[PDB]
Amino acid sequence: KRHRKVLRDNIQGITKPAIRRLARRGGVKRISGLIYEETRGVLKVFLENVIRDAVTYTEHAKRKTVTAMDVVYALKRQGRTLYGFGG
DNA sequence: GCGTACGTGCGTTTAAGCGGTGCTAGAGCTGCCTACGACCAATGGAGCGGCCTCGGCACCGGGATCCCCCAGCCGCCGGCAGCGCAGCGCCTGACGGG
């Protein structure tokens, strides 16, 4: 097809074990059940901040596709530089 | 010390994941044309310097809160000690039995 898109409930795509594994890499031993909801918001809260300016780069370039070279650029402005994709 | 809820484990189950199409959109590049920003020479007046004088603020002194504190004070009530007592089991009568 050529219309519509998946635009619902995708915040639940981050399934409960996925965070549970992620936190294990952080070394936390025991986690209460309440914390799952906050990080999803927190993860989202951080996220569009990265996209919003990333989107801004593309429109100034008058593209339609989002390149990785733009993604790192905004990540530089926010502060967290990334090695391994460009430069 | 209490207790719940989150780790551990088991048993579905399902959507990720793989591998496979098929498409065209959009990025990349080229050709070519234009305009617009740098450059140059002049010009004057906006901005910056130098004085320089009042009053907004500083300072004071005084009077005005106003929270902060707390013993006063009582109410309350429960503990507590004393008192009156309710109920029971035994004590002990009433009266026939032993």
UniProtKB/Swiss-Prot annotation:
Modified residues (N6-propionyllysine): K1, K16, K29, K62, K64, K76
GO terms assigned for molecular function: DNA binding; protein heterodimerization activity; structural constituent of chromatin
Chain positions found as Phosphoserine: S32
Residue ranges: DNA binding: 1-5
Placement of covalent cross-link Glycyl lysine isopeptide (Lys-Gly) (interchain with G-Cter in ubiquitin): K76
N6-(2-hydroxyisobutyryl)lysine: modified positions: K1, K16, K29, K44, K62, K64, K76
Annotated S-S bridges: none
Modified residues (N6-butyryllysine): K1, K16, K29, K62, K64, K76
Biological-process GO terms, alphabetical: nucleosome assembly
Transmembrane segments: none
Sites bearing N6-acetyllysine, chain numbering: K1, K16, K44, K64, K76
Keyword annotations of the record: Acetylation, Chromosome, Citrullination, DNA-binding, Hydroxylation, Isopeptide bond, Methylation, Nucleosome core, Nucleus, Phosphoprotein, Ubl conjugation
Localization annotation: Nucleus; Chromosome
Residues recorded with modification N6,N6,N6-trimethyllysine: K5
Cross-link (Glycyl lysine isopeptide (Lys-Gly) (interchain with G-Cter in UFM1)): K16
N6-glutaryllysine carried by residues: K16, K44, K62, K64, K76
Residue numbers bearing the N6,N6-dimethyllysine modification: K5
Family to which this protein belongs: Belongs to the histone H4 family.
Function: Core component of nucleosome. Nucleosomes wrap and compact DNA into chromatin, limiting DNA accessibility to the cellular machineries which require DNA as a template. Histones thereby play a central role in transcription regulation, DNA repair, DNA replication and chromosomal stability. DNA accessibility is regulated via a complex set of post-translational modifications of histones, also called histone code, and nucleosome remodeling.
Protein name as catalogued: Histone H4
Phylogenetic lineage: Eukaryota, Metazoa, Chordata, Craniata, Vertebrata
